[PDB]
A paper describes a structure:
RECQ helicases catalyse the unwinding of duplex DNA with 3’ to 5’ directionality, driven by energy liberated by ATP-hydrolysis. RECQ-helicases are strongly implicated in the maintenance of genomic integrity, principally through their participation in the homologous recombination (HR) pathway for repair of DNA double-strand breaks and restart of collapsed or blocked replication forks, but also have roles in toleration of microsatellite instability and sister chromatid decatenation. Loss of function of WRN underlies the complex progeria Werner Syndrome; defects in BLM underlie Bloom Syndrome, which is characterised by growth retardation and immunodeficiency; and defects in RECQ4 are associated with Rothmund-Thompson syndrome, which displays growth retardation, skeletal abnormalities and premature ageing.
The aromatic-rich loop (ARL) is a highly conserved motif in RecQ helicases that serves as a molecular ‘sensor’, detecting binding of single-stranded DNA and coupling it to structural rearrangements that enable ATP hydrolysis. In our high-resolution structure of BLM-HDΔWHD, the ARL is disordered and is not visible in electron-density maps. In their paper describing the crystal structure of BLM in complex with DNA, Newman et al. observe that the HRDC domain packs against a shallow cleft formed between the D1 and D2 domains of the helicase core, with the interface between the different modules being highly polar in nature. In our high-resolution crystal structure of BLM-HDΔWHD, we observe the same ‘parked’ interaction for the HRDC, even in the absence of the WHD, but in our liganded structure we see that the HRDC domain swings across the face of the core helicase fold to make a series of polar interactions with the ssDNA-15mer, which is presented on the surface of the D1 domain of a second protomer within the asymmetric unit.
Residue numbers in the entry: 639 to 739, 744 to 798, 816 to 1068, 1207 to 1290
């Protein structure tokens, strides 16, 4: 009943909320739970949002941040999230900045002005639990009624100084024990809880037989056939496996780079920037901690070249594929020889007891159960592991384009022009990204670029009807994008 009122478009804030949604974000339709969480936030409620990767958590706090006077402070332990969101917001001409760790002094000075201007201020938990200058800046905003909200983006002491400021916590963790632990911490606030299925609608799950001395050649062949020009990740069990996987792909002309703790800080920074920008690196061959630290929205494939340690690890590692919502593939190469490799690592782990080993073995038991279960829908298997009941077993049958492997068991001239145009528009976004200091997908994302190419239009009134196209973006990037589209005028209709 409280949640049905959160579906209303008749609040005092609705007109401004919808104006900013359409004109500043360039959007047209809300996704599951977005309108409800946004309305609860603008009504002053504390919120807890449980939403999988790709669901659209960012808009849940960024759109209320734009509507409200003053500053929304966003706490996040993920540096990749902070950099991505500040680039995204800056590209949209939404004032935003971060404090993670002289440049801080300029931010504190701007926040103290009559008009702080900054709408979203991103900070790390370490920065907000140590910087006394940040605390007094927040005190100054609070006294002028310009401290709008505290957000924790990926929620996996401060309420005493600012008790009237609402809190919004968001998480993509499917672990129900972690979800309940976060809710326990927020319980005194009596937050509105918005939950939904953790099913990743756009991911295709596969489990393939692994040849222990030939998996690199199978990766190379699959990538050339399905995603020759798209980014991907190959997760490996060890640093040496990363290096041999990258070596093998490099010897065959595929731009692959190993990404792990063995690299120097200089080499890590170079591999990260080449892969994020599609600049001389198509695939990163990574250990789990390293692959989970980079936030690219258009990862078209995640391949697990060896067995993951747990289903929770598998879901969260494969799950970062396709944050843009476009179809992506999640291939797990399975051999029981990798179970033995993992058991040896478990037995040799330093400071390990029968309990830590038992925990690791129990995690391995469930991962192998998924690999050996060749009948039940893989979407159902993943959600059953996390205790999510009520998932439609017919999902893969209803959407065969994203069917898991267990449920599985012509080009026109105008479309050729659409593909050529899309290629030129992506190249334009890469050159614009260098000029504006953002990654190409923060000039225009995958879906916006795909729809711009499909239109083949150079009319701003048509282009402004596409999701993600905004008047502020056409003022900054429009001459370049429209110059490309103009060349396709014979094919528009
Ligand atoms: N209502 C919407 N309509 C269209 N695109 C949207 C909408 N909400 C979010 N998006 C886009 O979907 C993508 C994924 O959103 P994001 O906030 O990164 O998801 P999450 O943080 O939940 O993984 C982004 O490119 C974002 O701009
Ligand atoms: Ca958004
Ligand atoms: Ca289920
Ligand atoms: Mg996010
Ligand atoms: Mg409350
Ligand atoms: Zn299925």
């Amino acid at each position: 009943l409280k949640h049905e009122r959160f579906q209303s478009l008749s609040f005092p804030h609705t007109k401004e909320m919808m104006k900013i949604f359409h004109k500043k974000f360039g959007l047209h339709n809300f996704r599951t739970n977005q309108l409800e969480a946004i309305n609860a936030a603008l009504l002053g409620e504390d919120c807890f949002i449980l939403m999988p990767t790709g669901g659209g958590k960012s808009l849940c706090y960024q759109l209320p941040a734009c509507v409200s006077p003053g500053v929304t402070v966003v706490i996040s332990p993920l540096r990749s999230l902070i950099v991505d969101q500040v680039q995204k917001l800056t590209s949209l001409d939404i004032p935003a900045t971060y404090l993670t760790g002289s440049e801080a002094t300029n931010i504190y000075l701007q926040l103290s002005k009559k008009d702080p201007i900054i709408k979203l201020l991103y900070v790390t938990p370490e920065k907000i639990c140590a910087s006394n200058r940040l605390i007094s800046t927040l005190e100054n905003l609070y006294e002028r009624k310009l401290l709008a909200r505290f957000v924790i983006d990926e929620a996996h002491m401060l309420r005493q100084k600012f008790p009237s400021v609402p809190v919004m916590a968001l998480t993509a963790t499917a672990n129900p024990r972690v979800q309940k632990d976060i809710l326990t911490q927020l319980k005194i606030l009596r937050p509105q809880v918005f939950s939904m299925s953790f099913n990743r609608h756009n991911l295709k799950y596969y489990v393939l037989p692994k040849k222990p001395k030939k998996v690199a050649f199978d990766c190379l062949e699959w990538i050339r056939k399905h995603h020759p020009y798209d980014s991907g990740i190959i997760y490996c069990l060890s640093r040496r496996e990363c290096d041999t996987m990258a070596d093998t792909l490099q010897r065959d002309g595929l731009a692959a780079l190993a990404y792990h703790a063995g690299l120097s800080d200089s080499a890590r920074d170079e591999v990260q920037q080449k892969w994020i920008n599609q600049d001389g690196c198509q695939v990163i061959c990574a250990t789990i901690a390293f692959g989970m630290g980079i936030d690219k929205p258009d990862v078209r494939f995640v391949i697990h070249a060896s067995l993951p340690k747990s289903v929770e690890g598998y879901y969260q590692e494969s799950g970062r594929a396709g944050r843009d919502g476009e179809i992506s593939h999640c291939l797990l190469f399975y051999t029981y020889h990798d179970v033995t490799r993992l058991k040896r690592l478990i037995m040799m782990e330093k400071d390990g007891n029968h309990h830590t080993r038992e925990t690791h073995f129990n995690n391995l038991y469930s991962m192998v159960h998924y690999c050996e279960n060749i009948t039940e829908c893989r979407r159902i298997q993943l959600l059953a592991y996390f205790g999510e009941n009520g998932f439609n077993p017919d999902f893969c049958k209803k959407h065969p384009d994203v069917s898991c492997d267990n449920c599985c068991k012509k080009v026109s001239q105008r479309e050729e022009m659409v593909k050529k145009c899309l290629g030129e528009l992506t190249e334009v976004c890469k050159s614009l990204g260098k000029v504006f200091g953002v990654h190409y997908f923060n000039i225009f994302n995958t879906v916006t670029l795909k729809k711009l190419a499909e239109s083949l239009s150079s009319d701003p009134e048509v282009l402004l009807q596409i999701d993600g196209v905004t008047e502020d973006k056409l003022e900054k990037y429009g001459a370049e994008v429209i110059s490309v589209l103009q060349k396709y005028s014979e094919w528009t209709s």
